[PDB]
Write an enzyme that holds these catalytic residues in place. Structure first.
Site, PDB file in Angstrom:
ATOM      1  N   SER A 195      51.609 102.508  43.231  1.00 35.42           N
ATOM      2  CA  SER A 195      50.622 101.775  44.016  1.00 35.42           C
ATOM      3  C   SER A 195      51.146 100.384  44.351  1.00 35.42           C
ATOM      4  CB  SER A 195      49.248 101.752  43.325  1.00 35.42           C
ATOM      5  OG  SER A 195      49.143 100.780  42.315  1.00 35.42           O
ATOM      6  N   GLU A 322      43.828 110.594  45.882  1.00 33.75           N
ATOM      7  CA  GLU A 322      44.073 109.171  45.675  1.00 33.75           C
ATOM      8  C   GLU A 322      42.767 108.394  45.552  1.00 33.75           C
ATOM      9  OE1 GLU A 322      46.863 107.863  45.045  1.00 33.75           O
ATOM     10  OE2 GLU A 322      48.404 109.205  45.875  1.00 33.75           O
ATOM     11  N   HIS A 435      44.327 109.129  41.521  1.00 37.38           N
ATOM     12  CA  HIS A 435      45.310 108.075  41.782  1.00 37.38           C
ATOM     13  C   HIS A 435      45.861 107.529  40.467  1.00 37.38           C
ATOM     14  CE1 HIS A 435      46.251 103.688  42.311  1.00 37.38           C
ATOM     15  NE2 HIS A 435      46.928 104.133  43.353  1.00 37.38           N
TER      16      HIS A 435
HETATM   17  C1  LIG Z   1      47.896 100.460  37.837  1.00 33.97           C
HETATM   18  C2  LIG Z   1      47.109 101.646  38.267  1.00 33.97           C
HETATM   19  N1  LIG Z   1      47.649 102.778  38.784  1.00 33.97           N
HETATM   20  C3  LIG Z   1      46.567 103.656  39.057  1.00 33.97           C
HETATM   21  C4  LIG Z   1      45.370 103.059  38.712  1.00 33.97           C
HETATM   22  N2  LIG Z   1      45.693 101.768  38.195  1.00 33.97           N
HETATM   23  C5  LIG Z   1      44.674 100.796  37.741  1.00 33.97           C
HETATM   24  C6  LIG Z   1      43.427 100.713  38.637  1.00 33.97           C
HETATM   25  C7  LIG Z   1      42.092 100.369  38.336  1.00 33.97           C
HETATM   26  N3  LIG Z   1      41.362 100.471  39.574  1.00 33.97           N
HETATM   27  C8  LIG Z   1      39.861 100.173  39.833  1.00 33.97           C
HETATM   28  C9  LIG Z   1      39.383  98.712  39.500  1.00 33.97           C
HETATM   29  C10 LIG Z   1      40.578  97.614  39.333  1.00 33.97           C
HETATM   30  N4  LIG Z   1      41.242  97.382  40.699  1.00 33.97           N
HETATM   31  C11 LIG Z   1      42.619  97.252  40.930  1.00 33.97           C
HETATM   32  O1  LIG Z   1      43.387  97.319  39.949  1.00 33.97           O
HETATM   33  C12 LIG Z   1      43.216  97.026  42.390  1.00 33.97           C
HETATM   34  N5  LIG Z   1      43.393  98.108  43.206  1.00 33.97           N
HETATM   35  O2  LIG Z   1      43.907  97.906  44.458  1.00 33.97           O
HETATM   36  C13 LIG Z   1      40.061  96.312  38.580  1.00 33.97           C
HETATM   37  C14 LIG Z   1      38.691  96.168  38.232  1.00 33.97           C
HETATM   38  C15 LIG Z   1      38.201  95.037  37.562  1.00 33.97           C
HETATM   39  C16 LIG Z   1      39.057  93.981  37.196  1.00 33.97           C
HETATM   40  C17 LIG Z   1      40.411  94.092  37.524  1.00 33.97           C
HETATM   41  C18 LIG Z   1      40.903  95.234  38.199  1.00 33.97           C
HETATM   42  N6  LIG Z   1      42.257 100.865  40.550  1.00 33.97           N
HETATM   43  N7  LIG Z   1      43.431 101.017  40.035  1.00 33.97           N
END
Ligand SMILES: Cc1nccn1Cc1cn(CC[C@@H](NC(=O)/C=N/O)c2ccccc2)nn1
Ligand SMILES: *[C@@H]1O[C@H](CO[C@@]2(C)OC[C@@H](O)[C@H](O)[C@@H]2O)[C@@H](O[C@@H]2O[C@H](CO)[C@@H](O)[C@H](O)[C@H]2NC(C)=O)[C@H](O)[C@H]1NC(C)=O
Ligand SMILES: *[C@@H]1O[C@H](CO[C@@H]2O[C@@H](C)[C@@H](O)[C@@H](O)[C@@H]2O)[C@@H](O)[C@H](O)[C@H]1NC(C)=O
Ligand SMILES: *[C@@H]1O[C@H](CO[C@@H]2O[C@@H](C)[C@@H](O)[C@@H](O)[C@@H]2O)[C@@H](O)[C@H](O)[C@H]1NC(C)=O
Ligand SMILES: *[C@@H]1O[C@H](CO)[C@@H](O)[C@H](O)[C@H]1NC(C)=O
Ligand SMILES: *[C@@H]1O[C@H](CO)[C@@H](O)[C@H](O)[C@H]1NC(C)=O
Ligand SMILES: *[C@@H]1O[C@H](CO)[C@@H](O)[C@H](O)[C@H]1NC(C)=O
Length: 526
Positions: A195, A322, A435
């Protein structure tokens, strides 16, 4: 057991894996800690040292907000950092095969986390399996995330932007100068990430300063042409003073604002990061890459379009579902604990959450293309459609578009479509091939028979690990030994891709073509 690097001496530890041994060097600094006056700027050349550095435990993770939406739930907490946070976190790790190799291909891993989160210490980034099975050398680095890493006042060296990228770039420099002592080949180095990581890898293909620090590249569910990938200079600066007024550092001499932002403790900076955009999004990169004119010299979609990147082989790919991951971080009617059957109106409300500053007609165009069902009356129709909308828009179509544009300039490109759902996946079933949940397969985790994975998953990981290594060493991600499907090059015309799963690995064409033409031809217009 002790290695002499070009600025100091480091000691490692021995790990028993599969009746073999892997030397792990955990937590080797590559820069002067960006504390004090150094907060917010490019990482500085680490001066020489005298002792034997004891690199026998992961280092500090860079400061970051934590996903607290599911306390106690492995599916979310799996991703939260598993060492101390600290501004002092510019370190890296090295896994070498034992016995020490001679001219080993090197794999450099760059984690994801929306450019706001993530750390190398994660269980599912352990490089010991890959070192054991394929006798490559695995390296991964912590880079600064969030505003500490990407706060941008363009031009201003006190906060020029892209610092976390320059963190990364400095770690590739370290491998160029030091990986020989470990038995690694600086002339055979493959970047790979996931990602936000995958977007960082693609940005290192554009950034001229990185061209001489790696040979090939692998992109997992991310690229720079993704809508979340690059922040504008318009909203970047809006985002800094909004963080300054929130911290009472509103001044007018921009340099003196920075000085103010440095005597604030890291927790105050983390807290205000969220409120900096008025209407956030589950994929809201509040502080990410910008066109700094140093690392990134132009608008990357232009550099892409006009062939202004390192010419070499790419391996690109995405997962079947995803988008589902994000529906439970805000989308109404969605939860991880029920089947999340939503109606038409919950769907429409879910579009405003993912597309807040988008025209009424723009939201309507999406609804039109995804809700003229292959057949109605099905109750998941709306639930599945919103999943795909988020997936196709945020990851699948930009990955494919990046690969077409890259391949058009004559380079070998390979595209995969990961469609296995982990038997150990903690989230529910409607969320599908989520994802992020290929990473454990890439890193060889189903290979530990003690780890509850099915035999079919061991076979699949085995083949994936081989393919990834063959691409790393030989620019060609085949599995020649067992009678397996050969992986064809992705040409702009035919657009072939390889599916990955336990059953069969079939060869298909033009993934999500209709959905992607909407997103890449008639939706950027709104
Ligand atoms: C590294 C990885 N590979 C696949 C998945 N993950 C982690 C992840 C978690 N999420 C969903 C909420 C989250 N948002 C983001 O991390 C940005 N996305 O663009 C968050 C929420 C609250 C505070 C801080 C960050 N989405 N991915
Ligand atoms: C699926 O669950 C969501 C939210 O719920 C659960 C699992 O967790 C939080 C608790 O407060 C809930 O009681 C429940 O244990 C449901 O979403 C809610 O649905 C209600 C009826 O439609 C609404 O009144 C609420 O506003 C709404 N809340 C949110 C945050 O969306 C949803 O209905 C459940 N779906 C199914 C099919 O049962
Ligand atoms: C660094 O480590 C040195 C050796 O560590 C010890 O010996 C090795 C063989 C392992 O058994 C390890 O688990 C032991 O702790 C120490 O002698 C030295 O003091 C350490 N230095 C610092 C600064 O921590
Ligand atoms: C720029 O920022 C303006 C201010 O946003 C408001 O104040 C900050 C401190 C946050 O709390 C935020 O949530 C508030 O909405 C916005 O009004 C403006 O729309 C932004 N964009 C532009 C282009 O000016
Ligand atoms: C490793 O391989 C490269 C490939 O060109 C070669 O130039 C280099 O001399 C080799 N070094 C060792 C130590 O094998
Ligand atoms: C802003 O302040 C710095 C430090 O005092 C100074 O060097 C710089 O010239 C100032 N710029 C302007 C435009 O006043
Ligand atoms: C090939 O198949 C054999 C079993 O016949 C298996 O032991 C081996 O791990 C497989 N290799 C790869 C790279 O999948």
């Amino acid at each position: 057991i002790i290695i002499a690097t070009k600025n100091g001496k480091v000691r490692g530890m021995q790990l028993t894996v599969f009746g073999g041994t892997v030397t792990a060097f955990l937590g080797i600094p590559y820069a002067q800690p960006p504390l004090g006056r150094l907060r917010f700027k490019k990482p500085q050349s680490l001066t020489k040292w005298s002792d034997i550095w004891n690199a026998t435990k992961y280092a500090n993770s860079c400061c970051q907000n934590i996903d607290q939406s599911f306390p106690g739930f492995h599916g979310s907490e799996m991703w939260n950092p598993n060492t101390d946070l600290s501004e002092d976190c510019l370190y890296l790790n090295v896994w070498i095969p034992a016995p020490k190799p001679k001219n080993a291909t090197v794999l450099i891993w760059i984690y994801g986390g929306g450019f706001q989160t993530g750390t190398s210490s994660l269980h599912v980034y352990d490089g010991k399996f890959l070192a054991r099975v394929e006798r490559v050398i695995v390296v991964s680095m912590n880079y600064r995330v969030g505003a500490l890493g990407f706060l941008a006042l363009p031009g201003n060296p006190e906060a020029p932007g892209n610092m976390g990228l320059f963190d990364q770039q400095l770690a590739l420099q370290w491998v160029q100068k030091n990986i020989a002592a470990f038995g690694g080949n600086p002339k055979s180095v493959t970047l790979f990430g996931e990602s936000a990581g995958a977007a960082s890898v693609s940005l290192h293909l554009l950034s001229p300063g990185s061209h001489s620090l790696f040979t090939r590249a692998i992109l997992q569910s991310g690229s720079f042409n993704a809508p979340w990938a690059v922040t504008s200079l318009y909203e970047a600066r809006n985002r800094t003073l909004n963080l300054a007024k929130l911290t009472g550092c509103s001044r007018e001499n921009e340099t003196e604002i920075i000085k103010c932002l440095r005597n604030k403790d890291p927790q105050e900076i983390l807290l205000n990061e969220a409120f900096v955009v008025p209407y956030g999004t589950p994929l809201s990169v509040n502080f990410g890459p910008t066109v700094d004119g140093d690392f990134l010299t132009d608008m990357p979609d232009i550099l892409l379009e006009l062939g202004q990147f390192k010419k070499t082989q790419i391996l690109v790919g995405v997962n079947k579902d995803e988008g589902t991951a994000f529906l439970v971080y805000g989308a109404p009617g969605f939860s991880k604990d029920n089947n999340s059957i939503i109606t038409r109106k919950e769907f429409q409300e879910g579009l405003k959450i993912f597309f807040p500053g988008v025209s009424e007609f723009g939201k309507e165009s999406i609804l039109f293309h995804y809700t003229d069902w292959v057949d109605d009356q099905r109750p998941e129709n709306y639930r599945e459609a919103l999943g795909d909308v988020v997936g196709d828009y945020n990851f699948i179509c930009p990955a494919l578009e990046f690969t077409k544009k890259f391949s058009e300039w004559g380079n070998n490109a390979f595209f995969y479509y990961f469609e296995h759902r982990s038997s150990k996946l903690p989230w529910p079933e409607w969320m599908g091939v989520m994802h992020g949940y290929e990473i454990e397969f890439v890193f060889g985790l189903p290979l530990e028979r003690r780890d509850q994975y099915t035999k079919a998953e061991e076979i699949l990981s085995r083949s994936i690990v081989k393919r990834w290594a063959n691409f790393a060493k030989y620019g060609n991600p085949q599995e020649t030994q067992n009678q397996s499907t050969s992986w064809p090059v992705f040409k702009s015309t035919e657009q072939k891709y390889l599916t990955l799963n336990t059953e069969s690995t079939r060869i298909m064409t033009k993934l999500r073509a209709q959905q992607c033409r909407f997103w890449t031809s008639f939706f950027p217009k709104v």
